[PDB]
Design a protein around this ligand. Structure first.
Ligand SMILES: CCCCCCCC/C=C\CCCCCCCCCCCCCC(=O)N[C@@H](COP(=O)([O-])OCC[N+](C)(C)C)[C@H](O)/C=C/CCCCCCCCCCCCC
Ligand SMILES: CCCCCCCC/C=C\CCCCCCCCCCCCCC(=O)N[C@@H](COP(=O)([O-])OCC[N+](C)(C)C)[C@H](O)/C=C/CCCCCCCCCCCCC
Ligand SMILES: CCCCCCCC/C=C\CCCCCCCCCCCCCC(=O)N[C@@H](COP(=O)([O-])OCC[N+](C)(C)C)[C@H](O)/C=C/CCCCCCCCCCCCC
Lengths: 464, 464, 464, 464
């Protein structure tokens, strides 16, 4: 029958199609070209992003050394002030170093007029302290008369062209935070020399003296925001080429999916009517090609990411996160799709089919063990949280347990529990039981069962 | 027979019971609701405890920076004095910083009159040194005339309202320890702003200069004890709801267990008399439902923990350890009990039954390997203890070996043995043999046998 | 026949022997008692050794802080002098701190007259510098006129009762090392208070300024040797009890081995003569009991270790290493021997026999993989040795590779190779190939084959 | 037939050949001797290289402490200057320490006249700064008038026999780097005393103040190049012996390969003509001996490495990398070739054949998983690169992922992602999904499938 022959044309391997009709498999070549071009585009994007990130990080480190009093490398998380004098000296040192920046900095930084932020009236530096509107606190008499309104008092500082901030008085009893805003603009000379494209950076520096905890310890932070700007192509052409290749692949895959859907409809209308027997939904799902779904998803992701990258490279978006995520996911998807080419040979198809037939039982076992994992996570978070640095937050607990079951950072956890004793022998004994039981169970039973499932699936595939 | 039909009603799946009698499985819904409510209660308790712990830790760090002379972060375990001058300066610095606390601290701390402890006569700070009653020690002449009575000499220090301690003279040759007791009370402003509940903390600060070792090195420690106190609801209602749900679940499960016991009694009295044949204890154990035992245990633990949490949240107990342990264990138990729902489908029941039938042989192999593990622990503790930081105590030895068999911190152990050489080539050679033999055996035979046991159990389950 | 019945009495389980003759298995009870007593003795010995080691280590740390100029904790391996002034100040600081020790030390240390060592003429401190007899070295003119004779010039320093060393002049161009010898004696007050046994320690302190490398960097070390001495029982009785129990067990096991040998001789003389057929050596080996060999070995080791421990506890040997090794090995052996009791039940015997029948093929595979492991060790040592801290010595290379195959410290090795680049791209590429190939092979083939061997042995045992 | 008998002589085991013809297997003894001699030569070479490397490293550390202002151990990667004053003080300190080296150094270092490098006119020290020809940069006005020509301005410094550099003025706005070149020569006294061979080292010291990044932070580096020179045997004889043994082994193996090729040619010309049937290429490959190929490769590598080592030991090449690589590869190859001896016994041949028959499917599975691994590498590099220190470069990403799949440095990666939050919740969520999916897949499916493949191959070998 015509339907039988047309269905036989479907599901044949590309080699069989070439034997039957002598049509060159140009779709396969197109997909290979797509893999190559998307990988090249991702590599170039990554190299440029690496350069930009390195420049930003080095400038931020230089700013930290320039403006933070007594700063040392590797102490960002513990850098804090503990006395009123320390806070005053830190703030004054930051402002003073700002005021004499041209004659001390190794980098060519230029002041930005009006860069003090929204709280500045055109001054380059803004020194703002925020405190509660009314903050009469009396721990001795147990008085908490508090007005939750926040009051922002700012001091405007301007650099000399070509000292009222010294009279700053803090409100420690009701202080919330102290912030310093200013902007510095410079030129990336490596970009000037190498790629001849003049990139002029603008760093927005924010120094925070955070007292939101009101715990007597005020951490000190320095953060930067960068605005790239051209200051008075092969990449764009390659991006256009990538977009065109992805669009062509998407069109071909969509047409193939439509043809498969039409063939499925013809088969079902023939079988339900001429033969009378009703067919199931699995017979419908057999007609779809999951590889084509993967390909169209990768094409859509690549097209969106390439549009975003074109916008970014023209200094218009500066939103690298979403574009990078899209491009990386698309590249991963195409490199996974290479498995379809690998599946056309039975020797590789044995292993691929072993994985495919093992997947359902593996997922079921994952569902079975997820509840035990979650119970252990909750118990560890609630009990060992106050006493263990690795159990402070639920995500941290999950990461610690996942590392434990894979044999990483075990003795560190045990020694952390041992050194402080947990401030209670009962807590220490519970931690011993908890860790030993969890590691023993998840390593010597769950992993072994995963291995057993995979081995059984391989045995079934090898001996049908 | 009536007994046969009633026993057939027992052991049927919930779906079969619904088919037979059309009774909605409301016990299952009750257990799901119980899981949800206990998880929510545990999450809320954990968040509040996290806030309290963070506040306490930050205040303790601030106190360490304020009162410990030359203190630096990350040096608590090595912070010590080595000369008489160092000890004198440390003590005097602590007291002096206490006396000028209001004008230097970033936190609003208030003095506590009469907070010097039992050894104070109403003074805020107590500076006590403890020494032996008679301590004439002559290492040159080998004289050890010692009276083991301890003498406590205290100095009372009071802060100014709105210097005799400078004449302190120590008895180094017979000194036991020097301690400083005082209390500071403050207000948690985050609690004031966010949850509007005024919490007034009271920190009991104890600085210890410990000379109990009499080894010429005196470690210096700072410890704090916190007493939370309200200073002049949804949580309680949710706790009551959790208690009621757990009580209802406990009642239903106990009634089901009683019905099962009655059915077992009827079956045994029918079989032993009418049929004459004596039945075994395993036939008795078959009639019990282990899931119901787990559920009633979790209910009891949750009820006790919720009562303790209600007491704690009213500022009456301040004993978080036991309540947290009970709540975490109950949450873990219910999340494990979810496996009973998972067992009603044969696809998941295959894996669950594989684990169940593998458990006995796994336990037997654990018994077999425990003696070898203990022998290795004892040998390592006795030999490598004097030369390895990881082998100082038996629990430390067990943790190190358990980490070793799971492939963690191996090269660190080897390098620790190598760097010092063990001060003997014989000890180094023994350590090489010990570590290599232990790791090789336990990784390449014991773990492989665990995998083999699990695989065999899975093979038996898959092919009955 | 009589021989058949007597041989049948041999090899029966203890339960079968009890059934046959009604003889209480008192040898088993004796061995259990032996296990208990040796474990208790080892635990007590370990606790006492822990106390002694802690005291010695704390005193050594105090000495390092007292006598080493600018010393900081955790910098022993890098503590060195780099200029002539630094060396002079270090030596002078050490001697000056020695001369004013009583008025600065927190520990009660007494001077030891005549403790300066062999190079002192009765003075308490000896300051000796060693240099070549003739050391005219001219790097500019390439002159190496050297007399390898070493000349020791000493300066005698005596503490005041109840400054010529300042004129010390070094010979840097030919200097070998500078050493400082003195002794301090003290009293362990914890021993005085707790166990009432007066222990008077004598520390031999040696400070070394080593210039044997002649590399312009002189490391500085402080080492101590301790001589314990009583200064003007249950333990001994328990040691005697342990010795008696071990001797009785040794006698019984030797008698049993002799009886087995006699039975083997009777069987062989009957079979070779009456039956004519010649029997093999495996039939001889079947008659021996390996558990009895283990027991007699453990008894001999325990007896030797207990004699040494008795000698040590009387302050006569001070050689803890050999005694500790003997005692630990004996304890490990008896805890392993518990497996014989475990073997009397078939459920545990299944696993034990699985291990026993897997052992030969496991050993053969170990022989197969040892040559590859050794080749990789040699290649890594010769190539990556100059560029990797983990490949400096052959034992270090072996430890690093053994940790690598067990999934420990992998990224650390990779990052160490990456950070310095190996000072050559060829070396970096070779390191990449070397590490990837080694880890891949040994993890994904060798370990899998070990698992396969164990699984096959278990399959053979389970299905005979 | 004659051909059948001659082919039967081929492929027989050495024991069978000895039985047939009584010829002593002297080739096997020659190969054993070769293994021994190459291992001994490699060990001696490694020991000498260890001594040289240790001397060079110690001298470099001494130079770093002598010439780098404020240098501390373990801070090479972060050592940098951040102000103009800091750079000036660092440069001046380096030059000043050079000028007074004889009276401060602990090592006997001699000045080298004319050692300032190509940029020196015979002076011992060269202080050169490099800057752009025209470097008018105006970040405020966005001006980048740049002439990419580099201008090198040098200052010549000469040590006193038996201060114009103080007037050095830098061009920070256009500075590229500042370098200091000088040479110091010394004598290795350990070589003088121990092996009596006078080795006179010449260190070329280069201090770099790198401003190529133009980021306001100037890293400071010290690098040394060493030229060994004899200054006014058993090793050579052993090298000659090794060369002769390798040449003899190569000749014998080549002759055996030629004989095998001739036998293959005779067999093919007989079978294709007399029998008519055409044979395949696998029948040709069966006649070759892979062990002989391994042996000749190892012989060639050893001969080349020994020639290079002979050249090096005469102070003529100083290129240790290539020689070490060749020697290590040859030693690894011969230690692998020991497996051929192991293959002559069927008990070991079982395991060896298991590995051999598992190799093809293992390679196919590696090809299958390589594409997924590469996709994950690309995605991680592009996304987590800006936010993770472990994902900066593609090789670093590959090393991190390879360590992750083997259960190493997992929690460190998770905590690195957690601590900074990735500066975006979307990036953090993506990192969670990425890491969890990658680790789960590669550990619980890929490794299990490798184990299953090995187990299946072992099952096929065990039960033919
Ligand atoms: C759970 C489902 C089935 C899983 C099956 C897999 C089991 C593992 C498989 C093979 C065995 C591999 C190794 C097992 C290691 C077990 C170690 C147990 C603890 C040994 C303690 C010795 C030190 C000592 O004896 N410790 C004692 C002496 O102390 P110390 O002298 O060292 O002083 C320390 C001081 N300090 C203040 C207390 C810190 C100490 O006082 C007791 C501690 C209690 C230990 C808790 C035991 C919890 C074990 C339960 C685990 C269940 C799972 C089974 C595991 C076999
Ligand atoms: C035990 C039950 C059965 C278990 C079966 C599983 C076995 C493992 C499976 C597969 C093999 C995987 C790798 C095996 C690694 C074995 C390494 C052995 C030691 C190699 C030493 C090389 C360095 C050197 O040759 N080291 C020598 C040269 O020193 P150096 O030049 O490096 O200088 C160092 C200086 N220092 C002062 C000594 C520190 C050194 O002098 C000797 C050391 C003795 C080494 C002890 C050997 C103990 C091994 C017994 C283990 C038994 C279990 C079987 C293991 C196969
Ligand atoms: C060997 C017997 C059989 C064993 C069978 C088991 C095999 C493993 C099983 C499953 C697969 C699991 C993961 C495999 C990971 C393989 C990674 C290969 C290297 C990838 C490099 C990407 C980074 C890059 O592409 N790196 C390139 C780009 O550099 P970059 O941009 O990162 O810059 C770095 C700068 N620097 C100065 C060079 C440091 C770099 O230039 C090339 C490096 C060469 C990499 C060496 C490859 C050696 C692999 C041989 C191993 C053989 C064994 C088989 C393994 C499959």
């Amino acid at each position: 029958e015509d339907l039988r022959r047309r269905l036989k044309y479907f599901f044949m391997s590309p080699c069989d199609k070439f034997r039957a009709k002598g049509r060159k498999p140009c779709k396969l070549m197109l997909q290979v070209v797509k893999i190559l071009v998307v990988t090249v585009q991702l590599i170039l994007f990554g190299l440029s992003n690496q350069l930009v990130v390195t420049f930003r990080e080095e400038n931020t480190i230089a700013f930290r050394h320039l403006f933070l009093l007594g700063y040392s490398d590797g102490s960002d998380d513990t850098f804090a002030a503990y006395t009123q004098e320390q806070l005053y000296q830190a703030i004054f040192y930051a402002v003073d170093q700002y005021l004499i920046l041209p004659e001390i900095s190794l980098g060519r930084y230029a002041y930005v007029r009006g860069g003090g932020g929204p709280w500045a009236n055109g001054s380059a530096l803004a020194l703002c302290q925020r405190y509660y509107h009314r903050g009469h606190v009396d721990p001795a008499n147990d008085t908490f008369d508090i007005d939750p309104r926040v009051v922002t008092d700012c001091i405007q500082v301007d650099p000399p062209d070509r000292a009222s901030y010294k009279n700053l008085t803090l409100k420690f009893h009701k202080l919330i935070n102290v912030t310093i805003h200013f902007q510095l603009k410079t030129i990336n000379l490596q970009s000037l020399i190498n790629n001849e494209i003049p990139d002029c950076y603008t760093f927005s520096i924010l120094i925070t003296f955070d007292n939101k905890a009101h715990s007597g310890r005020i951490p000190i932070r320095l953060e930067t925001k960068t605005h790239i700007q051209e200051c008075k192509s092969f990449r764009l052409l390659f991006d256009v080429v990538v977009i065109l290749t992805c669009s062509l692949s998407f069109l071909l895959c969509a047409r193939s999916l439509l043809r498969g859907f039409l063939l499925q409809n013809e088969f079902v209308v023939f079988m339900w009517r001429r033969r009378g027997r009703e067919i199931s939904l699995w017979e419908r799902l057999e007609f779809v090609n999951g590889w084509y779904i993967l390909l169209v998803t990768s094409d859509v992701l690549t097209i969106s990411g390439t549009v975003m990258k074109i916008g970014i490279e023209a200094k218009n978006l500066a939103s690298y996160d979403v574009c990078s995520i899209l491009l990386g996911t698309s590249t991963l998807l195409v490199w996974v799709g290479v498995i379809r080419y690998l599946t056309f040979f039975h020797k590789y198809n044995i292993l691929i089919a072993t994985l495919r037939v093992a997947l359902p039982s593996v997922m079921r076992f994952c569902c079975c063990v997820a509840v035990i994992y979650l119970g252990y996570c909750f118990c560890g978070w609630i009990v060992l949280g106050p006493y263990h640095v690795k159990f402070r937050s639920l995500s941290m607990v999950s990461e610690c347990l996942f590392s434990l079951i894979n044999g990483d950072d075990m003795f560190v956890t045990f020694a952390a529990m041992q050194a402080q004793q947990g401030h209670s022998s009962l807590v220490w004994l519970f931690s011993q039981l908890y860790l030993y039981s969890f590691i023993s169970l998840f390593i010597y039973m769950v992993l072994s069962l995963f291995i057993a499932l995979i081995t059984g699936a391989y045995d079934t595939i090898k001996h049908p």
